[PDB]
Q: What sequence folds into this?
């Protein structure tokens, strides 16, 4: 029932993610083709999640296998994620430098997956962010 | 009006942002990413020459800071964006850019604001084939 780490693909198979960003971070995205770091740097497989935030909503296109590469270095934030992904080690301190943070959020939210919840992916500012930025293919500002 | 942000200082204090912009522009193998370099490499001498003579699209806005709030996800600081009521009483939203040496805390509602803009073409066109621009803040001035 919980919406998994990836749900949507291109007509060509690229993996699709979402994030609502600041103006400063959006300037870098146009001019550096990078997602700038900030805390967990969460990406979402569902637009309904990130659309709930103020800022510039962007549809991010990633190379096929991106989610798989992050999962290899993945850790679970809380127990709700630790239950759906029992095969992942628990989140330490310092995951932002080496790991991808998976977190279940927005349960009981009618707009998002009929209240079923969504597993977002934290890229931190280290390897997970590098994996995603290296595989980044395209972005699209939705208004 | 005092300069709270200047792109010239951004160029020298954030050279990593500049290098990657030029490398992304000159990278012939990634034709959908980054700035085109139509009016010169970002921040180059040609760029300011084209900014000066007005061949790169520019706009200038003056008004009052109406809201100091927070946009985006996973942000640590207190505010990163401002809404501006111009004299045509149009709404403008912009990030609260500051330099390393300028203080972010001077952004307060009711303080007066001036923002000078440049618009640099991106490689990727709009769906209908039109030229799409990266909005580049050149200078932000504020009253006290």
A:
């Amino acid at each position: 029932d919980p919406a998994g780490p990836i749900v949507e693909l291109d007509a060509q198979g690229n993996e699709i993610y979402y994030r609502t960003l600041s103006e400063q971070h959006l300037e870098i995205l146009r001019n550096n083709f990078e997602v700038p770091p900030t805390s967990e740097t969460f990406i979402s497989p569902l637009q309904s999640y990130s659309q709930e935030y103020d800022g510039k909503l962007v549809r991010l296109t990633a190379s096929p296998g991106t989610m798989n590469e992050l999962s290899k270095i993945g850790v679970t934030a809380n127990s709700g994620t630790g239950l759906l992904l029992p095969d992942l080690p628990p989140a330490r301190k310092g995951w932002k430098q080496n790991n991808a943070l998976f977190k279940l959020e927005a349960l009981k939210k009618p707009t998002i997956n009929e209240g079923g919840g969504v597993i977002n992916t934290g890229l931190g500012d280290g390897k997970a962010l590098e994996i995603f930025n290296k595989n980044l293919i395209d972005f699209e500002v939705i208004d | 009006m005092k300069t709270i942000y200047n792109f010239k200082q951004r160029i020298k204090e954030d050279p990593e942002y500049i290098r990657k912009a030029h490398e992304l522009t000159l990278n012939t193998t990634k034709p959908k990413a980054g700035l085109k370099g139509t009016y010169g490499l970002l921040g180059s001498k040609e760029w300011w020459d084209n900014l000066e003579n007005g061949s790169i699209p520019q706009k200038e806005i003056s008004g009052t800071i109406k809201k100091v709030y927070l946009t985006g996800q996973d942000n640590t600081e207190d505010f990163n964006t401002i809404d501006i009521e111009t004299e045509n009483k149009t709404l403008c939203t912009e990030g609260t850019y500051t330099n390393k040496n300028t203080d972010r805390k001077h952004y307060e509602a009711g303080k007066k604001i001036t923002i000078k803009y440049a618009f640099d073409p991106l490689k990727k066109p709009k769906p209908n084939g039109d030229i799409d621009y990266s909005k580049i803040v050149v200078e932000i001035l504020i009253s006290e």
In short: DSSP finds three helices and six strands in chain B. Residues 22 and 41 of chain B are 6 Å apart (CA to CA). The longest strand of chain B covers residues 58-69.
